[PDB]
Amino acid sequence: MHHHHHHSTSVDLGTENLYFQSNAGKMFIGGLSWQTSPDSLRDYFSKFGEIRECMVMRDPTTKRSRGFGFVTFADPASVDKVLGQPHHELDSKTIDPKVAFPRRAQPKMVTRTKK
């Protein structure tokens, strides 16, 4: 009665869009350096706790970094340890490592006073 559709022309990978359970637990590392690599971040942060995965935003056009990334800690205790420690130095400069924040809903009424 019902038929399933399949795609034949696929260029991008399909291993991320299936998982929806694991989302929270990541840390957004800001102000990284030009030398800081996802491996460097994993190597540096692995020193505070255990990391599951690391990611640094780069451009395939220039291969240059934007100065921000994330780190996925495999321990809830490491997030606690990092949360208490606000100061983080990398390449002799202070960067902005913080835990992800959720989105909020919208209230009622916008325009109350009409002319």
Q: Cβ(88)–Cβ(94) under 8 Å?
A: yes
Task: State which fold the 1-115 domain adopts.
Answer: Alpha-Beta Plaits (3.30.70)
H/E run at residue 30: strand 26-30
Between β-strands 65-73 and 26-30, what pairing exists: parallel, antiparallel or unpaired?
antiparallel
Length of the chain: 115
Show the CA angle centred on residue 99, arms to residues 94 and 103, nearest 5°.
Answer: 130
Half-sphere exposure of 81 (CA within 13 A, CB side): 12
Domains of the chain, by residue range, sit at 1-115
Residues 6+ apart with CB under 8 A from 86: none
With CA atoms as reference, report the closest residue to 68 among 113, 18, 26, 11: 26
Method: NMR
